[PDB]
Each structure stands twice: as structure tokens, then as C-alpha cells.
Amino acid sequence: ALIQIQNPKNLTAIKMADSDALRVGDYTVAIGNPFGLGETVTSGIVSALGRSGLNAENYENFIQTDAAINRGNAGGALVNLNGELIGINTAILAPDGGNIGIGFAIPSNMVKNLTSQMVEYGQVKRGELGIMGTELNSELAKAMKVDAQRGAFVSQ
């Protein structure tokens, strides 16, 4: 979502980086407000990329990180060591409501595309290519004599 500050006076914006160059192993720095305590910074790394399944209907390309993230970190910034925005901290994997080192963030390149539509039109113009599909496992590549074990399989 996008909100607008009334009477913007003397603010500081963040430079967004190209998240599509991120690699598993980069150091990450999380910024948020757990439990209303205040601006809290934690450190971590890029655990994995492309994570999804927490909510299958949602468009989720989550980056996994071991940076500490609790209730209130939502909407916080995930930046690299240079302070350039790589993702927006979204959800954690906590069976007990306390962080155990699994945070998920939506890549900046997705946030950059999603914010730009809300600036001009106020909503998202959902586009479609017009194909059905499902995930490619290692079993399906054997039947289709395909080399790659991962990707998008065109049903129609």
C-alpha cells in the first residue's frame, strides 16, 4: 500500500536498488518497529530467493532472511550494506509469535512496479499473458525430455 504524508516538510527518501541482482549470501539489514518499542535495526543475510506458499493466492516472490523481524516490523525496509532498498519486510514464520530467524520481504523491483501504478491511477492495472501453467518438478522433466528441472510449464 501507499500513503501520503500531509504537509511533507524535511523528509528523507530511500534509494531503491535492483533486487533482481540479489544473491543468496548477501548481508541484509532489517529496519522496523517491533512491539512499538521504536526504530529497531537487526542484521542478517539473504537466506533464499523466490520463496512463496505462505498464501498461494498472493503474488509472493519473498526473499528469506535470518534478520530479526517481529510484530511491528511490517512495512519496514530491508536494505543492503549501502542502505539501498532491496525489499519490504512482510511476514515471518513463527509458530509462537516470536521471531526464530525467518523473515520474508517483497523485492524492491516488485515494490517499484507496484508503487508506480498507485501514483498515476490509484489502483493496479492487472495485465495478463493468457496462459495456464504449474510448477516444473524433476519428475516432469523426464517425461518431457526437458533438461531444466525448474520453471514454468505451459498447459495451454
Binding site: 523481524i69 511491528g72 511490517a74 512482510t90 511476514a91 514464520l93 509458530p95
Partner: peptide, 5 residues
Amino acid sequence: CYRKL
């Protein structure tokens, strides 16, 4: 399972 923040 999965939680929000």
C-alpha cells in the same frame, strides 16, 4: 504455520 507482522 505462516504468520504476519
